[PDB]
């Protein structure tokens, strides 16, 4: 085990051996952004691709080409931490290499001039932090991945609601990545219609017309011909026997001399078999049969030239006669089988008004641009750019893959543009499925839903910026002169940076980090949102979309999703899942070699998963991958059943791979209903960090993975030895292995103390390690918020008893003992930020001076001479946070008055105060102050102190490193000085600085002494320049917005203790409001005298089927019992031997366990330390599905010498009498959620009213009243309550004179009223009168 692991090992239950370890949890974000930047030669994903897409930019036939070579990311000016401190965006400058080439205007092409630009700067691009987030204005933002419909073609059914007469009308939708949409639909009359993105539905054949196809070509390509031959007489037809399937005979079907089907008998299977085996091709047919058919081709009279019948014309006797006399032996009719084979292109042609190509293009243009006369080339260009222009219409590589797969082509790589064969095949497949030789697609298939991560969307937005700037530069290079301008006046960085900051800042998917819990951050970063751009609205979305598809198995969590109105549209991603090359979702499976279950793992996507038979993870394998049972339970095509041992193709990697991290953190998930697990996880993500987090007694083992992978802990990068420990920094001496040869030094980790998070929680780190302890790479040095020694400690574990205690736990409410508040274990620290801004008005700049008109010296007492509160001062509501003065102008005082002002000292410039005050009802201590000055002539006093405070620390760090290097140099100087005449007596007693001035016998050695002296000088000079640079970077003004002189930020910290009304919860979905604080004596106590902490209602168990809490209570009681036993054996300090024996017998506890722990640690010290840490109770780890069975809990209870049944006899703390029927007691791990009553509670009697409508303000910052809505009005109307409603409507809100008269009347001790007319009604009158409507209040 590791050193931090050896410190405190967690006893792990669980039978199956973990083959695969949990992957890096943040892989998605880091890998996506890495792929995004990724300077790479061959154009793959990456900025390079965008450039080659947009470039080369050629002039409007001006013969001045612009070429792109490569780009470079400038080094960020501000590191991450300092950038967060200073409130600027952490970003990198983007530089691009370009060449302008000018040809010869009237000569064979050849570069006349080529000028290379010195890596032009085209704006700033924000960088991603180590953890995968973005600092955009000193605020941590997260870009959630987006789930959306993949490009391609989809064939939907949309039945039931089609005119409510059945008539299932199918449709094919073609959606590109970039470009307009294409839609093909049917109609009751089996005509297949096209509808440009969102317009009217035209007959499809028009597009075929636009593709330059003639009517005969179309009818050839689509319909199956039917031949009527005339041989020596009467109309013989070429017949394919298998075509006869299912047809009542209408005539006498004679053939080859023998009547086969008598006229009137429907063709029977006997006849069909006869005819098939006979090989009948041609049959003579009565003229009545042909008297009804339709003609395929346009048969003209070849001899004279006059047309007779046109293409797709119904036949009449006269036309049949003309055809027979003209000499036409072969007639091609259409096969219209009203059951299977319909006249679809024919009927569309009949409804299709267009005939020629030109008329089709005209109709298209009149659809796209209605009203302007269409000219041929306008329509041609419009139509070309609509669907076939590479720039506007692009499907994808993925889009093309899906497209070819839909039309069943082996070839994956195609051209982006929609070729005509594509459209024809699509329409063929649509009519084919319409006949029923094909399946419809299911939208919910993960094979149809693609994930767009950060880098892809950023690339898209950047391409958009480029298309903007390219059009602009195009025009600028065309109009303007060619050779005068150099390649930096031409390119503007403003639009690129504008677009990027717009996307990153003001977007729906770019949102504030939910930063109060490590779990909250980690789960927020791995999220997949179906909203945002090109995403369905919640109200429009159907129930079918929000269902859980069987495909989600092992890819997205089925149970973790917000239970609010957008339930089902969020779907947090599962633990083990990854993204495909194309951005799809794939999950690992173990291969099965026919008998043996091998160890190579393959990642499968949805479609590939569909085909194979996958075995479950919870299948018993003995030592060689063989199944214990002959018939095992598997799933093959989304349906489970039994298969034989030598049939399983794959097997699940681990039980956890179905569920997300949040669900994996809940213990005993297998015994909790999915609903209550859902609510438990959703709430558990809201828990607030307490003062000292300890650990869960009942965990799942995943805690260390979550804690480490989040960036809240401090983890060693290069292992070494702890040199210095302070509650601000940890200084470590590196190990020689990892130690850089040249210019290594030591590693120093500065910690961050209480700062304000987005949610107003405290962010404080504590050191774990002590001086001189060895640390290895990847151990936990410092604990982040709500984590201990690497483990997640969200809340605290307390002793609960399930019983009703005089109906104080009546409903889900919770009773708590005063010992909990006394011991100060549920008290949280919160942190408000306040800002005072001094701008520049045109009447004069405001001032920060302490001279403030008509304020008592009480208010100034706590302000320094500069006007800023003292650090550490205790403030209260209404106190002046900082002093500011508003300038006053045009005083125009009389000269005598001016003299009086001079003697008295009154200032005409002031007389008004803009000083910030503490908000009403908030009181805390000022822990920190910051000052940001845009212009300032010199740094202000306070600015000097803050600069020195940051500076001295930085100086200390550089000095420490320098001092180590100096000690090394001095040691080396002594080692050279010993050569050339050993001098160790005199030297060591004279000062060290008297070693350079000393001399030696003139040799190479003197050259070496000169070398080392010059090295000493060089180290000094390099130290000084680095220090100077750092101090210049620290001191400089941090660029503020136009018009703002300076800003002062003040942080208040407030300690909030738990009180009645706050919300508390468990991990299993049980909730409650803390109802009463009882005295210690009243609480129940067992015979031994220990009182319980929480008294929880049992009636919450049966209807809320969360049984996990009962097992949790039992196992927690067992763990605390063992911990008590070890504390008892340890307080008496028997001897190491006894402890080792006891701890080993405990750690073993049966067999089949994957633990293997104990007895490898140092015989005495490390064992004693581990016992010290476990004396408070040994932490257990029950995995989700490979958990602890009842018998194991019974055994563990027995080992502690407690009743195996988990119930104890209890004494009533108030009365002392025993309770009948012993009750379940034990320790459960509970959490305090962020809903604190003091934030919720609010009341107002009278206060400020609104400007326009003289109603009281809405809100909490300003007092604000409750909304008496229409439903409440109706409630009152159901009663006869007329006067209450009347006063509520006028005197309480809207009548100005009424409200003041009522205030005075109430004060007078009389209770009447004078309702009057509400002002809002008068506003209504005025607004209606502003129209042309005269509305008057009549009188008689």
Partner 1 sequence: DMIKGKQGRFRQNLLGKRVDYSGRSVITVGPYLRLHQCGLPKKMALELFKPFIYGKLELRGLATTIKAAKKMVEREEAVVWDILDEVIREHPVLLNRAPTLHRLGIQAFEPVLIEGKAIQLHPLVCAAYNADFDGDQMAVHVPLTLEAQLEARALMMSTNNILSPANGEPIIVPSQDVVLGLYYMTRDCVNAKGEGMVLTGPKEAERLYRSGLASLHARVKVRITEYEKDANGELVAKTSLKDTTVGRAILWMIVPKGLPYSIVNQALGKKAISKMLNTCYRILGLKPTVIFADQIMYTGFAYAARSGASVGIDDMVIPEKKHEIISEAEAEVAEIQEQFQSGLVTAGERYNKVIDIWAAANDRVSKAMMDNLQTETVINRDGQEEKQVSFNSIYMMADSGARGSAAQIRQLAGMRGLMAKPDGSIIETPITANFREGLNVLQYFISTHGARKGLADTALKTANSGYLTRRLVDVAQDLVVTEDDCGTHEGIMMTPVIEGGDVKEPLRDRVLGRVTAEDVLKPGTADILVPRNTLLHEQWCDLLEENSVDAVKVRSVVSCDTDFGVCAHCYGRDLARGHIINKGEAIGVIAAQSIGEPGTQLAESSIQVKNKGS
Touching partner 1, residues 533-592 (CB under 8 A) = 543-544, 546-548, 550, 553, 558-559, 563, 565, 567-568
Strand partners, 585: 579
Nearer to partner 1 (CB atom), residue 488 or residue 633: 633
Ordered DSSP codes for 342-361: --HHHHHHHH----SHHHHH
Is 1235 a residue that touches partner 1 (CB under 8 A)?
A: yes
- What's the min distance (Å) between Cβ of 517 and partner 1? 18
Q: Do residues 651 and 614 make contact, with C-beta atoms less than 8 angstroms apart? A: yes
**758-817: contacts with partner 1 (CB under 8 A):** 801-813
Choice between 767 and 1108, CB closer to partner 1:
1108
CB atoms within 10 A of CB 270: 8
Closer to partner 1 by Cβ: residue 224 or 1277: 1277
Least Å distance, CB 561 to partner 1, is: 8
Distance from C-alpha of 936 to C-alpha of 838, rounded to nearest angstrom: 12
Phi (first) and psi of residue 304, to 5 degrees: -85, -35
In the range 1174-1213, which residues lie near partner 1 by CB under 8 A? Answer: 1185, 1187, 1190, 1193, 1205-1207, 1210, 1212
Characterize the bridge pairing of strands 880-882 and 916-917: antiparallel
- CB-nearer residue toward partner 1: 602 or 1240: 1240
Q: Residue 1013 contacts by C-beta under 8 Å, 6 or more apart in sequence? A: 996
The site map against partner 1 for 1033-1072 (x = CB under 8 A) is: --------------------------xxx-x-------xx
CB of 1054 to partner 1, least distance (A): 15
Three-state DSSP class for residue 968: helix
SS3 795: coil
Q: Does 853 bind partner 1 (CB under 8 A)?
A: no
Pick 1137 or 1278: Cβ nearer partner 1: 1278
Q: Which of residues 1263-1292 bind partner 1 (CB under 8 A)?
A: 1264-1281, 1283-1284, 1287-1289, 1291-1292
Hey, which residues does 774 pair with through a beta bridge? 721
Q: Under the criterion CB under 8 A, does residue 1312 sit at the interface with partner 1?
A: yes
- Supply the minimum distance, in Å, between the C-beta of residue 1099 and partner 1: 5
Counted residue by residue, the chain has a size of 1340
Instruction: Please select the residue that binds partner 1; options are 15, 16, 501, 671, rule is CB under 8 A.
Output: 671
Q: Which is nearer to partner 1, 1046 or 1104 (CB)?
A: 1104
Residue 878 binds to partner 1 (criterion: CB under 8 A): no
Tokens representing residue 568 in the block = 């089902």
Give min distance, CB of 873 to partner 1, in A: 22
1251 binds partner 1 (CB under 8 A): no
Give whichever of 746 and 1073 is closer to partner 1, judged by the CB atom: 1073
> What are 774's two structure tokens?
């060895």
- Asked whether the beta carbons of 1186 and 12 are under 8 A apart, the reply is no
Q: Does 1321 bind partner 1 (CB under 8 A)?
A: yes
Rounded Cα distance between 37 and 569, Å, is 30
Instruction: CB nearer to partner 1: give 581 or 1314.
Output: 1314
Interface with partner 1 by CB under 8 A: which range of 25-33, 307-315, 665-673, 824-832?
Answer: 665-673
Instruction: Report the residue from 188, 1258, 1297, 1335 that binds partner 1 according to the rule CB under 8 A.
Output: 1258
- Residue with Cβ nearer partner 1 (419 or 1284): 1284
Least separation in angstroms between CB 1269 and partner 1:
5
DSSP 67-96: EEEEEEEPPPSS-HHHHHHHT---EEEEEE
Task: Select 426 or 559, whichever has its Cβ closest to partner 1.
Answer: 559
Residue 740 in contact with partner 1, rule: CB under 8 A: no
Q: Kindly tell me which of 97 and 538 has the beta carbon lying closer to partner 1.
A: 538
Q: What angle do CA 870, 875, 878 make, to 5 degrees?
A: 120
Distance CA 1242, CA 1231 (A): 25
Residue whose C-alpha is closest to residue 535's, from 61, 147, 136, 807: 147
Cβ distance to partner 1 smaller for residue 592 or 801: 801
Question: Between the CA of residue 1337 and those of 446, 1254, 1315, 1321, 1330, what are the distances in Å?
Answer: 65, 21, 17, 11, 16
Site string for partner 1, 1000-1039 (x = CB under 8 A): ----------------------------------------
> What phi and psi, each to the nearest 5 degrees, are found at residue 1124?
-60, -45
Tell me the C-alpha distance between 963 and 655, whole Å.
54
Give the binding range for partner 1 (CB under 8 A) out of 324-332, 355-363, 1036-1044, 1306-1314: 1306-1314
371 binds partner 1 (CB under 8 A): no
DSSP 645: G
CB of 590 to partner 1, least distance (A): 15
Cα(1207)–Cα(874) distance, integer angstroms? 50
- Contact between 1256 and partner 1 (CB under 8 A)? yes
Contact 394, 177 (CB under 8 A): yes
Least distance to partner 1 from the beta carbon of 803, Å? 6
Which string of DSSP letters, residue by residue, matches 1012-1076?
HHHHHHHHHHHHHHHHHHHHHHHHS-----TTEEEEEEEEEEEEEPP-TT-EEE-TTS-EEEEEE
Q: Which is nearer to partner 1, 897 or 1081 (CB)?
A: 1081
Tell me, residue by residue from 1074 to 1113, as one string, x for binding to partner 1 by CB under 8 A and - for no binding: -x---------------------xxx-xxx-x-x--xx--
Nearer to partner 1, 159 or 972 (CB): 159
Q: Is the peptide bond between 56 and the residue preceding it cis, with omega within 30 degrees of 0? A: yes
Q: What is the x/- site pattern for partner 1, positions 932-971, by CB under 8 A?
A: ----------------------------------------
Q: Find the binding residues for partner 1 in span 166-225 (CB under 8 A).
A: none
Q: How far is the CB of 917 from partner 1 (least distance, A)?
A: 17
The CA-atom distances, in angstroms, between 194 and each of 204, 215, 364, 424, 477 are 5, 18, 12, 13, 41
Long-range CB contacts for residues 1202-1210, cutoff 8 Å, separation at least 24 = 1202/1117, 1202/1118, 1202/1121, 1206/1113, 1206/1114, 1206/1117, 1208/1086, 1209/1086, 1209/1087, 1210/801, 1210/803, 1210/1084, 1210/1085, 1210/1086
Residue 678 in the binding site for partner 1 (CB under 8 A): yes
Q: Which stretch binds partner 1 (CB under 8 A): 19-27, 312-320, 1040-1048, 1295-1303?
A: 1295-1303
CB 471 to partner 1: min, Å: 35
How many of the chain's residues bind partner 1 (CB under 8 A)? Answer: 133
**Footprint (CB under 8 A) of partner 1, residues 597-656:** 616-618, 633, 635, 640, 652, 655
Burial class (CB in 10 A: 0-12, 13-18, 19+), 1079: exposed
Choice between 117 and 812, CB closer to partner 1: 812
Could you tell me if 839 and 1118 are in contact, meaning their C-beta atoms sit under 8 angstroms apart?
Answer: no
Closest distance to partner 1 from the beta carbon of 241 (Å):
30
> Among 1242, 1297, 1300, 1322, which residue interacts with partner 1 (rule: CB under 8 A)?
1242
Q: How far is CA 1269 from CA 703, 1019, 1137, 1266, in A?
A: 47, 75, 74, 9
Instruction: Looking at residues 97 to 116 of the shown chain, list those that interact with partner 1 (rule: CB under 8 A).
Output: none
- By beta-carbon proximity to partner 1, the closer residue of 735 and 813 is 813
**Distance, CA of 888 to CA of 911 (rounded, Å):** 7
Query: Is residue 1293 involved in binding partner 1 (CB under 8 A)?
Result: yes
Q: How far is the CB of 1237 from partner 1 (least distance, A)?
A: 5
């Amino acid at each position: 085990y590791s050193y931090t692991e050896k410190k405190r090992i967690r006893k792990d239950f669980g039978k199956r051996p973990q083959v695969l370890d949990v992957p890096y949890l943040l892989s998605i974000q880091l890998d996506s952004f890495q792929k995004f930047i990724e300077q790479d030669p061959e154009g793959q994903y990456g900025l390079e691709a965008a450039f080659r897409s947009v470039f080369p930019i050629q002039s409007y036939s001006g013969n001045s080409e612009l070429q792109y070579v490569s780009y470079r990311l400038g080094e960020p000016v501000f590191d991450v931490q300092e950038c967060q401190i200073r409130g600027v965006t952490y970003s990198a400058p983007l530089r691009v290499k370009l060449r302008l080439v000018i040809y010869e205007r009237e000569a064979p092409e050849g570069t006349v001039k080529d000028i290379k630009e010195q890596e032009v700067y085209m704006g700033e691009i924000p960088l991603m932090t180590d953890n995968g987030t973005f600092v955009i204005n000193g605020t941590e933002r997260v870009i959630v991945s987006q789930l959306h419909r993949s490009p391609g073609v989809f064939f939907d059914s949309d039945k039931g609601k089609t005119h409510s007469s059945g008539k299932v009308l199918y449709n094919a939708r073609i959606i590109p990545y970039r470009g307009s949409w294409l839609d093909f639909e049917f109609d009751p009359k089996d005509n297949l219609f096209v509808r440009i993105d969102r317009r009217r539905k035209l007959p499809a054949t028009i597009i075929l017309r636009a593709l330059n196809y003639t009517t005969e070509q179309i009818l050839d390509l689509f319909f199956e011909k039917v031949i009527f031959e005339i041989r020596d007489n009467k109309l013989q037809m070429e017949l394919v026997p298998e075509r006869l399937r299912g047809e009542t005979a209408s005539f006498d079907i004679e053939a080859n001399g023998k009547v086969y089907v008598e006229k009137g008998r429907r063709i029977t299977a006997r006849h069909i078999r006869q005819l098939e085996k006979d090989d009948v091709k041609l049959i003579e047919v009565p003229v009545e049969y042909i008297a009804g058919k339709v003609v395929a081709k346009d048969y003209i009279d070849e001899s004279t030239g006059e047309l007779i019948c046109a293409a797709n014309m119904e036949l009449s006797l006269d036309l049949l006669a003309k055809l027979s006399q003209s000499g036409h032996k072969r007639i091609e009719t259409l096969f219209t089988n009203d059951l299977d084979h319909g006249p679809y292109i024919s009927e569309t042609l009949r409804v299709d008004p267009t005939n020629d190509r030109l008329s089709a293009l005209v109709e298209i243009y009149r659809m796209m641009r209605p009203g302007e006369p269409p000219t041929r080339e306008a329509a041609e260009s419009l139509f070309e750019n609509l669907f076939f222009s590479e720039d506007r219409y692009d499907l994808s590589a993925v889009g093309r893959m899906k497209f070819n797969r839909s039309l069943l082509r082996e070839e994956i790589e195609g051209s982006g543009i929609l070729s005509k064969d594509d459209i024809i095949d699509v329409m063929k497949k649509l009519i084919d499925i319409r006949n029923g030789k094909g399946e419809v697609d299911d939208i919910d298939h993960l094979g149809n839903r693609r994930i767009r991560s950060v880098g892809e969307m950023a690339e898209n937005q950047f391409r958009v910026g480029l298309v903007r700037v390219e059009r602009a530069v195009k025009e600028r290079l065309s109009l303007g002169d060619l050779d005068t301008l150099m390649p930096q006046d031409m390119i503007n960085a403003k639009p690129i940076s504008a677009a990027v900051k717009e996307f990153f800042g003001s977007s729906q998917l770019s949102q504030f980090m939910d930063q109060n819990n490590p779990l909250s951050e980690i789960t927020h970063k791995r999220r997949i949102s179906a909203l945002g751009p090109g995403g369905l609205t919640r109200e429009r979305a159907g129930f079918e979309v929000r269902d859980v598809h069987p495909t989600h198995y092992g890819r997205v969590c089925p149970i973790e999703t917000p239970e609010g109105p957008n339930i089902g549209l969020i779907n947090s991603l599962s633990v083990y899942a990854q993204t495909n090359e194309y951005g799809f979702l794939e999950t690992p499976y173990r291969k099965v070699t026919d008998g043996v279950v091998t160890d190579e793992i393959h990642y499968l996507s949805a479609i590939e998963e569909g085909n194979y038979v996958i075995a479950q993870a919870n299948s018993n394998l003995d030592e060689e991958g063989h199944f214990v049972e002959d018939l095992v339970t598997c799933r093959s095509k989304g349906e489970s059943s039994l298969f034989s041992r030598d049939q399983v193709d794959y097997m699940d990697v681990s039980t956890q791979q179905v569920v997300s991290v949040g669900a994996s953190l809940i213990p005993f998930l297998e015994h909790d209903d999915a609903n209550r697990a859902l609510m438990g996880a959703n709430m558990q993500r809201q828990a607030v960090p307490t003062l000292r987090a300890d650990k869960p007694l009942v965990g799942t083992g995943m805690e260390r993975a979550v804690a480490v992978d989040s960036g809240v802990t401090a983890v060693a990068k290069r292992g070494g030895v702890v040199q210095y420990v302070d509650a601000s920094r940890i200084v470590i001496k590196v190990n020689e292995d990892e130690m850089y040869p040249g210019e290594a030094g030591i590693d120093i980790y500065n910690l961050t103390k209480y700062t304000r998070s987005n949610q107003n929680t405290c962010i404080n780190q504590m050191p774990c390690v002590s001086l001189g302890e060895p640390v290895e790479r990847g151990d936990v040095l410092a604990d982040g918020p709500s984590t201990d020694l690497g483990e997640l400690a969200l809340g605290q574990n307390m002793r609960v008893a399930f019983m009703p205690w005089n109906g104080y736990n009546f409903e889900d409410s919770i009773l708590v003992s005063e010992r909990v508040v006394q011991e100060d274990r549920f008290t949280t620290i919160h942190i408000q930020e306040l800002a005072c801004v001094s701008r520049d008005t045109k009447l004069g700049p405001e001032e920060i001076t302490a001279d403030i008109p008509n304020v008592g010296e009480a208010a100034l007492s706590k302000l320094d001479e500069s006007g800023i509160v003292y650090i550490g001062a205790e403030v209260t509501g209404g106190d002046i946070l900082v002093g500011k003065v508003t300038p006053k102008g045009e005083t125009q005082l009389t000269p005598e008055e001016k003299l009086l002002r001079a003697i008295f000292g009154e200032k005409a410039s002031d007389v008004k105060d803009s000083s910030l005050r503490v908000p009403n009802g908030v009181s805390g201590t000022v822990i920190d102050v910051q000052v940001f000055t845009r212009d300032g002539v010199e740094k202000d006093k306070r600015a000097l102190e803050i600069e020195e405070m940051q500076l001295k620390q930085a100086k200390k760090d550089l000095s420490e490193e320098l001092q180590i290097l100096e000690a090394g140099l001095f040691s080396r100087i002594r080692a050279v000085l010993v050569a050339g005449g050993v001098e160790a007596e005199k030297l060591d007693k004279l000062p060290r600085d008297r070693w350079l001035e000393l001399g030696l016998t003139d040799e190479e050695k003197q050259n070496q002494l000169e070398q080392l002296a010059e090295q000493y000088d060089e180290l000094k000079h390099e130290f000084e320049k680095k220090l100077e640079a750092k101090r210049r970077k620290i001191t400089q003004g941090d660029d503020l917005a136009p018009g703002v002189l300076k800003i002062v930020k003040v942080y208040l910290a407030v300690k909030r203790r738990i009180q009645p009304g706050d919300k508390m919860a468990g991990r299993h979905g049980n909730k409650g409001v803390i109802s009463k604080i009882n005295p210690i004596e009243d609480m129940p106590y067992d015979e031994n005298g220990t009182p319980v902490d929480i008294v929880l209602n049992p009636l919450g168990v049966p209807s809320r089927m969360n049984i996990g809490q009962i097992l949790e209570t039992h196992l927690g009681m067992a763990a605390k019992g063992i911990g008590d036993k070890i504390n008892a054996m340890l307080k008496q300090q028997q001897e190491v031997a006894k402890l080792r024996e006891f701890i080993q017998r405990a750690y073993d506890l049966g067999a089949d366990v994957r633990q293997k722990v104990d007895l490898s640690t140092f015989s005495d010290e490390e064992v004693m330390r581990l016992a010290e840490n476990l004396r408070k109770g040994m932490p257990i780890a029950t995995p989700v599905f490979d958990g602890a069975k009842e018998a194991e809990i019974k055994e563990l209870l027995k080992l502690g010498d407690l009743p195996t049944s988990g119930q104890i006899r209890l004494y009533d703390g108030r009365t002392g009498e025993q309770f009948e029927r012993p009750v379940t007691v034990g320790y459960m791990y509970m959490l305090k959620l962020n809903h604190l009553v003091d934030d919720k509670m609010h009341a107002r009697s009278t206060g400020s009213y609104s400007l326009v409508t003289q109603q009281p303000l809405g809100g909490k910052a300003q007092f604000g009243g409750q909304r008496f809505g229409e439903m409440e009005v109706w409630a009152l109307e159901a009663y006869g309550a007329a006067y209450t409603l009347q006063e509520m409507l006028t005197v309480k809100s809207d009548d100005v004179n009424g409200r003041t008269k009522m205030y005075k009347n109430i004060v007078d001790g009389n209770h009447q009223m004078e309702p009057g007319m509400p002002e809002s009604f008068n506003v209504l009158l005025k607004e209606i009168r502003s129209l042309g409507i005269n509305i008057e209040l009549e009188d008689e």
